């Protein structure tokens, strides 16, 4: 399960997907290995 | 670049 204050959030206003550490303040759209490369 | 996808954002 993800680390805690992360989430997803949209791209473009309308297109795709970004993933936010929000209490770092820190744009992605990859995994901190807390869900891993597949699961 | 312009259409943000933010991987990049220059």
Same mark, same amino acid.
């Given at each position: 399960?993800?680390?805690? &204050?992360?989430?997803? =959030?949209?791209? =473009?206003? *309308? &297109? =795709?997907?970004?993933?936010? %550490?929000?209490?770092? %303040?820190? *744009?992605?759209?990859? =995994?901190?290995? &807390? %869900? *891993?490369? *597949? &699961? | 670049?312009?259409?943000?996808?933010?991987?990049?954002?220059?």
């Amino acid at each position: 399960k993800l680390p805690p &204050g992360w989430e997803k =959030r949209m791209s =473009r206003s *309308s &297109g =795709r997907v970004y993933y936010f %550490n929000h209490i770092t %303040n820190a *744009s992605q759209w990859e =995994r901190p290995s &807390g %869900n *891993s490369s *597949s &699961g | 670049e312009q259409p943000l996808t933010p991987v990049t954002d220059l």
